[PDB]
Design a protein around this ligand. Structure first.
Ligand code: MG
Ligand code: ZN
Lengths: 48, 21, 692, 226, 574, 83, 63, 237
RNA sequence: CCGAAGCUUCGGCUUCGGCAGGAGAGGUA
């Protein structure tokens, strides 16, 4: 709500990659974007 | 040891034992 | 499986059961090594799977209160001098005293040599106190280990995980047709075999009067005569062989408590679970890559690792509402050529070699009153064979207890002899474990300077990264014990042999030694003994002061450019054999509710193609392999037969139909008052019941 | 400079089972491969004779005990595997051991046929008290190598015959050592010293000659072109 | 290839054998052929050698954590009751040889056989689908064999001596064949520096430019090399047009060579080359003299002095506390900070005592296996251990495993050795639930078209500049900018364009961008695709497993969940 | 390329088979539909009159129809259209 | 409802689906696997499944 | 005793001076008994001739560059050590090469001493460009194998007799691989696949034909200690 | 669907005979 939809995807794709990079596992960012894309696909109605 | 007929197995131990299992 | 496993089963402390915990509810704090386990529970011997920390073993010196609390002994010390008075303490009373350590230098009078000693304070706090506060002391260095962990030489040089596996894998060894004791041992093997109870000991003193293969007669001093019988080729709970043999002469004098007869895994009264083999530590053409093992052919031509396994089959004869089943040779459906190994009673004859699908007993069922006789005969299952060694028949008319409703019982025993082969699992006492990768001719094997081939080859890449260096020390000491040594004392005893006993300054070839679990042979002693060993027939010393020897190549003939480590090591055979794990199937029996193939090896079943295996198929993009795997090979009842006919006739495979499990699901959903229907492109629900 | 001295063989006898053979002067390098060719042919393909089946009277299988003997049948079997036999005929020959009464059964009690000779008249086979007799009928055959047990009901036999594993090699241990001559003036050569130890059926100089026939007849499918 | 037991192939291939047996007039009816096959008559061992020819099977090991847990091979009949597996597929299967088991499945129809032969063949699946790195690579024994062979030892037998007066070069060879003939006599060592005339090996770039200039027609053009024999026999394994390397083969160098071959050559020469690297590795591993004895685990020379100094420094702190100054945590903290420096002085004395031709050193220095922490534990001192709660014990373990621990040291060593094993067993049941939850949500994402012609994108950092004015490459750029499609053209200082819209980002494009003063770039990502159902091929980018653009119809959804789930059991820190 | 001759299941090399098709998912269907035509020809030639075409390339001794189909594809003797 | 009932909480999803009278179009990977049809990915899509192959004119004329 | 299955040799001509002989079926274990001894008999028993010393003019000391020619002495040696020569004599002979003038001295200029012949008279030895003269005196003797330079010590007669290495062998590279075959129900059989590459003075087929005549008379010293020995008969051809 | 037995015109026809679920414990990777 504070920033917007585009910044949540950076925060998520970065906070997930830090955990994997700490222990030395290399995964491309295009693999986490596929799953993050499915987490933001719906809208909540305020008034109909 | 402590058993009537047993093979002679020599040991490297340097400590003595005051109890038996 | 063997005497050690039976002894260990009876000393187990289990945290589960009706009143305790659950494998799912238990967390991570009930599976930890508390500081209060010292002397009451073994921290090493525990399962490796989901029961890690929920099952443990009692220690050797522990004992139980009249309330249920485990105690352990200590030696009381006063004024800095260790006494010889033993007091048993529970974990709630030993946390108010300072308890010293077993490995502490003690003088002749009993005073500590070192000014400060390592002790154990109240909350398991380890400290370095000046030796003047000690209040108690340990009784022995092996107070904190169990009966299977105290049988590993050089235990203090091994990591905890590898010692854990070595102790767990010592209980899976199988008895072999001939047994032999370790060259390097620990001394626990003598009282671990008498207390297990698989040997025969004498209850009184006397002279032996008569000895045969199955009885021993002892004449006592007072006049009474006692005779002991033996179990020859008896089947244990796990299909192994339990055989007892006498080890006394016909005029020997026997004292009370002496071992009279041997047992399954026993050699002259002490437990022996494996064999001594000559080892080399080197890579070899990639045949021992990633924990594989290379063997020699002399281990098959000389029956070094061979075991006998026995099987048991039964059948029952009962009555029926149409008559009474009868066991007889007369069967009007099959020929007379396959009914030649049966006697005049319908049973096989002792000494006949049966095979898969052969006949064991002959039984028929009446269908009512002739030609009402049906065939129901006990046959050998798939992939079994062996001679017939015994038949036990129980009858009703000869006054024998029998279940109500049955008339006759019969049991048939079948035995086979299994040699070593590819896929069989070998092991050591230190955590070494692998399957046999290759078996080589004895001329293809590296050989020493006098022409002696090696018996087993182990890889060098697995030792440093797993921290079990006790095996290399074991090979060094085993070579020294096998060859025999002699320490020179012309100019006095050498400096490195000051603390050795006087009976260890000289040894004979094929000598047996003992290194206790936490007080044994140091490394100065081994390094000094490696340069004192005796020569062979010709005056040559093959292994130099480092424990390394120069080997020749048996395939090319040239010497290897660098010396290689050689020695003797103790190898056991584990009960995970490849003959009991191979399986295959094309078609066979199917289930009843969901018409899928059956499961298991005894029922000629199939292999599960689970959920995780479908994701790989969907990620490859293979849409036809998955469809064929899920319909015409599992459930499509009408397509299975057409597929078989097409394969036999050489035509094209047909198009799959619809699985039966879906229809079962639909009738399940309809039975919960749910109106589920399958529509078409324009309504008009499809019938989905065939019939046309 | 090319040499001409043709290799020459020469033997020396240290015992009646061990012998050494010198073969000088070979060419620089050809000293370890000739030794290994002969050790690999001497420890595999030498013909001999071995026992292949036994038949005690009263026993039916090998998992039982006879009455009056202090061993079961599997130990008499594992003690009849160190018998050094010899033969001259290419057909099975039946021996006979029949001993009774208190004593110790040895290998000197096997009355041989005519063409078979037992070479170990002092091995152990069992111990007898005054209540048992041992009647065995051993079958001797000739062959090469190591053949596993020939199954029973797959050969047309009865129900008392016990097949046995047969090892037909008459050789025990073979090694070699090369003494190289690496001088200057580029005049180098070699020298091989083979050592052959045979059991007791074949002299150390008839095994080298069976391996010399095998190798003089396997390296002949090469000189078929010229 | 694989190896299949005869009694298993007979049962798996029963109807094909029955048909072949009836066809070849070996029987009359199907029942007769069935009985003959089931009785194992000696006539069925010859048809079951052309029946199973070019008929693939599928091999599977459980758990199946990713795609490469199923692969298709070509069966061969062997003797025994075990299946024989290639050494180079154990990394993909995750299979050691201490008791594992695998299952076999048989395709039947034409479509299933074609899919197994084309999509699933083992020699087609070499690159990992999660990072694009090679999986069928030399490891363990092969690495040691190839590191021993290509090592230069100064002052060896028959090296180049630039002498004058007495004799000439004495160590120049006219062909590799002459060098081999000299090495068969003992005059020359494999790892001795020499000068050899090479004819069929391609010279390095600088030598080629200096000598031939326009091009090197290597079929018959001769040059001079200053190398060893092992390097020549190693370079004779690489393809014909690959330039000479002349380097020691650490594992990183081998990985780089394999990656270059995979990205610049067809996929059949790579499969033919790994198989011949494995042979040489296995051959030279057994002649390298790596062996373990208790006289190779050398101890530190001056260790008791180090320890006594760092024990006096602790008894002063103890005295202080005995009187009073610190509470308890200050004490424990200073004891930890003394016993964390003593292990580093012991470590740095051990890393200076050990020679460089030790079997224990060249196994961890060649990249085969192991660390130096294990080497310090085995021959130096173990150090500080942890209590069951998770805090360090202020008393250290001063004895190595080469000298043997005492009763109390061994007992307090098991507190942290049990926790690792319980946490390991427990964290295998929380990563297969995560995988199952990830597969189900992203199961409807499939490449549906070729291009949506959208204009949106995301911004990628792609290196940053230092205050001095020198660019610093981003440490994480292989997993964020490589293998992507540009969204807008890359311009610089209001000038021309270096790369154009719609181009993959390999290393040449990256270096061209970096050497022109460009940091921020705009790429096309799946997060901003305009396709209604599924995604398009251009937005996704390049497939990591094959190295080209994606195929219409792929299941990009399951690969993303099987690329985030397997890497998870190797995840536990605190 | 500069490869040695392939053996067994790796013939013809797939890097040349993939130059006649759009992707690796169409090659599967291409080969699996030619193999079925060849098998139908073999099993209908000995009975009556059919309409399919036999192997356009010379077979071996006992060759699977899939191998013949792949060899026909590699020799540029067939043609296909995409749905 | 077929894909959600086989994931978790079968009773809740089945009750809600029964009340709402939902309809399933069977257009996913899991549903096509369950009922026994070709999945809509890889070689199971329309473009690749409807390939028509016939010999070229010149080869047909030659043989 | 009989072998059961008689082995057979077959060839596979690749080039003109390279072949690939295959010998199968061999009883289990006889593939490694026949490999290393055929490789070594092939690479160190066949006689031949090669250059053993040279004496280029104008080099009393420092062997760096000779006046007139465009090559150092090491390249002259490398080009005068790959000469396929042959001699029908006994003791050392002597050859001469004297070309004076702008050109390219080649192997077609060494006048043959009536009896020895040069079989590759198209190789390049040097390129005399700066109007000079080359005079080389070579000594070609016979032998067997690879003999490293026989460093002498004439101390006077060897004013500048550079000693070279001598590749007397007519074969240049042999390699072998043992495979596996099937004879009935028994796999684990053997198959040897040699690979001989020769020079220009012998054909690859007379090598495995004259290396089976120095091994049927070396292993024939054993089958003469007792002629009747009960070996393994191979049977009629 | 398999076996046994008859007719069998060689496509097949007829008689008889025949089944497979849960709970707990231990183990291997
Ligand atoms: Mg494993
Ligand atoms: Zn898009």
């Amino acid at each position: 709500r504070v920033q917007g939809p585009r910044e949540v995807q950076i925060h998520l794709v970065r906070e997930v990659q830090e955990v994997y990079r700490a222990q030395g596992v290399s995964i491309h960012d295009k693999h986490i974007e596929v799953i993050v894309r499915q987490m933001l696909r719906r809208v909540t109605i305020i008034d109909s | 040891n402590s058993v009537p007929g047993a093979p002679n197995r020599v040991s490297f131990a340097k400590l003595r034992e005051p109890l038996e299992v | 499986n063997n005497p050690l496993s039976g002894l260990t089963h009876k000393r187990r402390l289990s945290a589960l059961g009706p009143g305790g915990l659950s494998r799912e509810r238990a967390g991570l704090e009930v599976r930890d090594v508390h500081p209060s386990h010292y002397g009451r529970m073994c921290p090493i011997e525990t399962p490796e799977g989901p029961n890690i920390g929920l099952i443990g073993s009692l220690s050797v010196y522990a004992r139980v209160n009249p309330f249920g609390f485990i105690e352990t002994p200590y030696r009381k010390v006063v004024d800095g001098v260790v006494s010889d008075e033993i007091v048993y303490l529970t974990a709630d009373e030993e946390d108010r005293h300072v308890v010293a350590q077993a490995n502490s230098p003690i003088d002749a009078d009993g005073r500590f040599v070192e000014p400060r000693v390592l002790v154990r304070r109240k909350a398991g706090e380890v400290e370095y106190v000046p030796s003047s506060e000690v209040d108690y002391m340990d009784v022995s260095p092996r107070q904190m280990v169990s009966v299977a962990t105290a049988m590993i030489p050089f235990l203090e040089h091994d990591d905890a995980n590898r010692a854990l596996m070595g102790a767990n894998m010592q209980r899976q060894a199988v008895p072999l047709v001939r047994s032999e004791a370790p060259l390097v041992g620990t001394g626990m093997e003598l009282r671990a075999a008498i207390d297990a109870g698989d040997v025969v000991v004498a209850e009184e003193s006397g002279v032996i009067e008569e000895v045969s293969a199955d009885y021993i007669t002892v004449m006592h001093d007072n006049g009474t005569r006692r005779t002991y019988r033996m179990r020859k080729f008896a089947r244990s709970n796990h299909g192994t062989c339990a055989n007892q043999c006498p080890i006394v002469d016909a005029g020997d004098r026997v004292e009370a408590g002496q071992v009279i007869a041997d047992g399954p895994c026993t050699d002259d009264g002490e437990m022996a679970l494996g064999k001594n083999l000559l080892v080399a530590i080197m890579p070899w053409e990639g045949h021992n890559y990633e924990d594989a093992i290379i063997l020699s052919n002399r281990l098959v031509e000389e029956d070094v690792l061979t075991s006998i396994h026995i099987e048991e089959h039964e059948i029952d004869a009962r009555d029926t509402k149409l008559g009474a089943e009868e066991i007889t040779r007369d069967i009007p459906n099959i020929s007379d050529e396959v009914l030649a190994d049966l006697d005049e009673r319908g049973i096989v004859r002792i000494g006949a070699e049966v095979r898969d699908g052969d006949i064991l007993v002959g039984k028929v069922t009446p269908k009512g009153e002739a030609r009402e006789v049906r065939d129901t005969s006990l046959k050998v299952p798939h992939g079994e064979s062996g001679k017939v060694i015994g038949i036990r028949v129980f009858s009703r008319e000869d006054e024998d207890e029998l279940p109500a409703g049955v008339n006759e019982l019969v049991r048939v025993y079948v035995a086979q002899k299994r040699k070593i082969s590819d896929g069989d699992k070998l092991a050591g006492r230190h955590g070494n474990k692998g399957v046999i990768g290759k078996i080589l001719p004895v001329e293809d094997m590296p050989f020493l300077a006098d022409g002696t081939p090696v018996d087993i080859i182990l890889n060098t890449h697995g030792v440093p990264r797993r921290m079990n260096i006790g095996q290399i020390l074991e090979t060094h000491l085993g070579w020294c014990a096998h060859s025999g040594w002699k320490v020179d004392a012309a100019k006095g005893v050498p400096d490195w042999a000051a603390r050795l006993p006087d009976e260890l300054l000289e040894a004979q070839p094929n000598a047996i030694v003992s290194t206790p679990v936490f007080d044994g042979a140091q490394e100065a002693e081994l390094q000094g003994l490696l340069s004192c060993t005796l020569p062979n027939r010709d005056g040559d010393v093959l292994v130099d002061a480092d424990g390394k020897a120069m080997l020749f190549d048996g395939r090319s003939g040239e010497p290897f450019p660098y010396p290689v480590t050689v020695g003797y090591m103790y190898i056991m055979k584990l009960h995970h054999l490849v003959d009991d794990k191979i399986h295959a199937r094309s078609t066979g029996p199917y289930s009843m509710i969901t018409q899928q193939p059956l499961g298991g090896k005894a029922q000629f079943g199939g292999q599960r193609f689970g959920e995780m295996e479908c994701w790989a198929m969907q990620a490859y993009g293979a849409a036809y392999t998955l469809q064929e795997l899920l319909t015409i090979k599992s459930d499509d009842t009408v397509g299975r037969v057409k597929v078989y006919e097409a394969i036999v006739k050489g035509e094209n495979i047909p198009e799959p139909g619809i699985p039966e499990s879906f229809k079962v699901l639909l009738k399940e959903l309809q039975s919960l008052c749910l109106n589920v229907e399958v529509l078409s492109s324009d309504g008009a629900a499809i019938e989905l019941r065939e019939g046309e | 400079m090319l040499i001409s001295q043709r290799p020459t063989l020469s033997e020396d006898v240290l015992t009646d089972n061990r012998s050494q053979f010198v073969i000088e002067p070979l060419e620089p390098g050809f000293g370890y491969t000739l030794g290994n060719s002969l050790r690999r042919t001497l420890l595999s393909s030498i013909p001999g004779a071995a026992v292949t089946s036994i038949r005690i009277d009263g026993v039916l299988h090998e998992f039982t005990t006879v009455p009056g003997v202090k061993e079961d049948v599997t130990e008499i079997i594992l003690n009849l595997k160190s018998l050094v036999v010899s033969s001259e005929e290419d057909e099975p020959v039946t021996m006979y051991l029949r001993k009774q009464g208190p004593g110790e059964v040895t290998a000197g009690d096997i009355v041989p046929p005519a063409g078979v000779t037992v070479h170990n008249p002092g091995m152990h086979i069992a111990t007898l008290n005054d209540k048992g007799k041992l009647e065995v009928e051993l079958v001797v055959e000739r062959g090469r190598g190591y053949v596993p047990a020939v199954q029973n009901r797959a050969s047309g036999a009865e129900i008392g015959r016990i097949p046995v594993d047969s090892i037909y090699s008459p050789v025990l241990k073979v090694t070699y050592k090369v003494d190289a001559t690496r001088v200057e003036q580029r005049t180098d050569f070699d020298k091989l010293i083979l050592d052959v130890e045979t059991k007791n059926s074949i002299s150390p100089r008839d095994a080298l000659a069976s391996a010399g026939k095998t190798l003089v007849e396997l390296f002949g499918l090469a000189r078929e072109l010229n | 290839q694989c190896g299949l037991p005869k009694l298993m192939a007979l049962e798996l291939f029963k109807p094909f054998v029955m048909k072949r047996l009836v066809d070849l007039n070996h029987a009359q009816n199907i029942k007769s052929a069935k009985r003959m096959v089931e009785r194992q008559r000696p006539q069925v061992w010859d048809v079951l050698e052309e029946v199973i020819a070019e008929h693939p099977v599928l091999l599977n090991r459980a758990p199946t954590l990713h795609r490469l847990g199923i692969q298709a091979f070509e069966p061969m009949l062997v003797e025994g009751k075990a299946i024989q597996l290639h050494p180079l597929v154990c990394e993909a299967f995750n299979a050691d040889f201490d008791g594992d088991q695998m299952a076999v499945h048989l395709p039947l129809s034409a479509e299933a056989q074609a899919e197994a032969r084309i999509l699933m063949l083992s020699s087609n699946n070499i690159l990992s689908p999660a990072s694009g790195r090679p999986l069928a690579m030399p490891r363990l024994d092969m690495v040691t064999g190839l590191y021993y062979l290509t090592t230069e030892v100064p002052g060896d037998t028959g090296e180049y001596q630039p002498a004058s007066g007495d004799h000439p070069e004495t160590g120049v060879y006219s062909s590799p064949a002459e060098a081999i003939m000299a090495a068969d006599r003992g005059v020359l060592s494999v790892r001795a520096k020499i000068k050899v005339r090479l004819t069929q090996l391609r010279p390095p770039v600088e030598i080629e430019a200096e000598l031939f200039g326009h091009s090197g027609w290597q079929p018959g053009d001769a040059w001079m090399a200053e190398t060893t024999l092992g390097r020549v026999m190693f370079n004779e394994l690489l393809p014909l047009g690959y330039p000479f390397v002349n380097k020691q083969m650490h594992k990183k160098v081998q990985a780089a060579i394999i990656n270059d071959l995979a990205e610049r050559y067809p996929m059949i020469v790579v499969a033919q080359t790994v198989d011949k690297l494995k042979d040489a590795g296995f051959y030279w591993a057994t002649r390298s003299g790596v062996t373990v004895s208790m006289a190779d685990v050398l101890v530190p020379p001056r260790k008791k002095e180090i320890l006594d100094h760092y024990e006096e420094r602790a008894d002063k702190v103890e005295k202080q506390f005995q009187r009073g100054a610190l509470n308890h945590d200050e004490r424990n903290e200073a004891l930890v900070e003394i016993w964390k420096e003593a292990t580093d002085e012991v470590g740095q004395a051990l890393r200076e005592h050990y020679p460089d031709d030790n079997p224990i050193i060249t196994i961890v220095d060649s990249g085969a296996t192991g660390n130096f922490t294990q080497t310090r534990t085995l021959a130096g001192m173990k150090g500080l251990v942890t209590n069951p709660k998770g805090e360090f014990i202020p008393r250290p373990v001063k004895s190595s495993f080469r000298e043997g621990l005492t009763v109390l040291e061994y007992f307090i060593n098991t507190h942290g050795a049990r926790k690792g094993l319980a946490d390991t067993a427990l964290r295998t049941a929380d990563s297969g639930y995560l995988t199952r939850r990830l597969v189900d949500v992203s199961q409807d994402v499939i490449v549906r078209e070729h291009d949506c012609q959208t204009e949106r994108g995301i911004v990628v950092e792609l290196a940053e500049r230092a205050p001095d004015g020198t660019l610093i490459r981003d440490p994480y750029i292989e997993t964020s900018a490589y293998a992507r499609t540009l969204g807008t053209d890359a311009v610089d200082e209001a000038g021309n364009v270096i790369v154009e819209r719609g181009q993959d980002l390999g290393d040449p494009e990256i270096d061209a961008l970096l050497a022109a003063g460009i940091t921020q770039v705009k790429v096309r990502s799946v997060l901003t695709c305009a396709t209604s159902t599924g995604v398009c091929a251009t937005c996704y980018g390049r497939s990591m497993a094959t190295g080209k653009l994606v195929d219409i119809g792929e299941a990009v959804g399951i690969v993303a969940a099987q690329s985030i789930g397997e890497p998870g059991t190797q995840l536990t820190m605190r | 390329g500069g490869y040695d001759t392939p053996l067994g299941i790796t013939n013809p090399p797939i890097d040349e088979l993939l130059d006649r098709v759009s992707s690796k998912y169409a090659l599967v269907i291409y080969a699996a539909k030619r193999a079925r035509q060849i098998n139908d020809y073999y099993n209908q030639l000995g009975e009556g009159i059919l309409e399919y075409v036999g192997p356009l390339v010379e077979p071996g001794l006992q060759e699977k129809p899939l191998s013949i189909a792949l060899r026909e594809i590699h020799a540029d003797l067939l043609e296909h259209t995409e749905g | 409802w077929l894909s959600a009932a086989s994931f978790q909480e079968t009773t809740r999803v089945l009750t809600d689906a029964a009340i709402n009278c939902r309809s399933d179009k069977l257009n996913g990977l899991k549903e096509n696997v369950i009922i026994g049809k070709l999945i809509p990915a890889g070689t199971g899509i329309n473009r690749y499944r409807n390939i028509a192959v016939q010999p070229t004119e010149e080869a047909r004329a030659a043989a």
